């Protein structure tokens, strides 16, 4: 199982952190991104809908992902943190910071950090009306 390399040198995966304001995704994949190692979402670690975007759920997801990756021989991660993008918000959700902190806390090495939020040159109409979300 895992790679056949010396233990001193790191094996790099890529961690996509899709932190929205509803819940957070921690998704480790191959360097190419085509093959995935583990994906733990904040909604898989809490029972309340309101808590799926909480920092605690993201921390639990990051610990699960880190343990699974260590079980598979990946020791270092490139981070690709994104917000919802498109019409919607361009800022990362509440869980992104806790997810990154818990990834680094469990002994996982961190490589390049990138913001891959989808940004439109310009987009379709945004979901709200011309008066917006009024409540």
């Amino acid at each position: 199982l895992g790679p056949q390399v010396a233990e001193g040198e790191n094996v790099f995966g890529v961690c996509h952190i899709f932190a929205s304001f509803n819940d957070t995704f921690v998704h480790v994949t191959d360097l190419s991104g085509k093959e995935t190692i583990c994906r733990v979402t904040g909604g898989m670690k809490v029972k309340a809908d309101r808590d799926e975007s909480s920092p605690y759920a993201a921390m639990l997801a990051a610990q699960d992902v880190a343990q699974r990756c260590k079980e598979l021989g990946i020791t270092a991660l490139h981070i690709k943190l994104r917000a919802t993008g498109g019409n919607r918000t361009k800022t990362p959700g509440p869980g992104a910071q806790s997810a990154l902190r818990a990834l680094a806390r469990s002994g996982m090495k961190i490589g390049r950090i990138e913001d891959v939020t989808p940004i439109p040159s310009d987009s379709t109409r945004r979901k709200g009306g011309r008066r917006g979300r009024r409540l």
Binding site: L1, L31, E35, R112
Partner: protein, 213 residues
């Protein structure tokens, strides 16, 4: 209990010879199961490697996308597919009291690799300038764009893909563009913003192995 990672093999991905650091990492593929072939599913895989991970020195905000078209001996041999600037880098240059001039060209190398190249430049505030804004007039912007397109076409269409990547590594194209346009409007942060392979010639193993080693 079936673990789907017990049937997956780890291959080492190798960069083309234009970069000092040869290996870029490991990629896992499900072993050959019946008709499905591990090799042909391993092909067409794009790795976005930062330049500082491909050359010992040099900047890290330039990333190269390399595509795997062959796998031999548990090694995936990649090739140039595209190039970009990191999101933070490109966001950091767009300031609010200057003109940003963008050009793009679809130009073919001598090997038949049609590339779309996007160049970006910014007008530079002079060291003794009191005026807050460094805007270029519309004809000046058009002249700068013409110069950028002409230089990009000259640098790509005359030579082959290997030397195109060799000169993209230090972004010499942007440096000569900036030196050329210093006379129309002094430019500030000139980079070939992005490169994509629109169309590539039919695969042959000889050229791929030549680009390696």
């Amino acid at each position: 209990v079936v673990d789907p990672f017990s049937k997956k093999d780890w291959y080492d991905v190798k960069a083309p010879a234009m970069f000092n650091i040869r290996n870029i990492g490991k990629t896992l593929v499900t072993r050959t199961q019946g008709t499905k072939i591990a090799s042909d599913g391993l092909k067409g895989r794009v790795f976005e490697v930062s330049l500082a991970d491909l050359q010992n020195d040099e900047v890290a905000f330039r990333k190269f996308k390399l595509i795997t078209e062959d796998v031999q001996g548990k090694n995936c041999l990649t090739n140039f597919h595209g190039m970009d600037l990191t999101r933070d880098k490109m966001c950091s240059m767009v300031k609010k009291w200057q003109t940003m001039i963008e050009a793009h060209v679809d130009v073919k190398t001598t090997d038949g690799y049609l590339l779309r190249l996007f160049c970006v430049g910014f007008t530079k505030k002079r060291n003794n300038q009191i005026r807050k804004t460094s805007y270029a007039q519309h004809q000046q912007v058009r002249q700068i764009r013409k110069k950028m397109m002409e230089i990009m076409t000259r640098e790509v269409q005359t030579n082959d893909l290997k030397e195109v990547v060799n000169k993209l590594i230090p972004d010499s194209i942007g440096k000569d563009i900036e030196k050329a346009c210093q006379s129309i409007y002094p430019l500030h942060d000139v980079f070939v913003r992005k490169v994509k392979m629109l169309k590539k010639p039919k695969f042959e193993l000889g050229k791929l192995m030549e680009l390696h080693g």
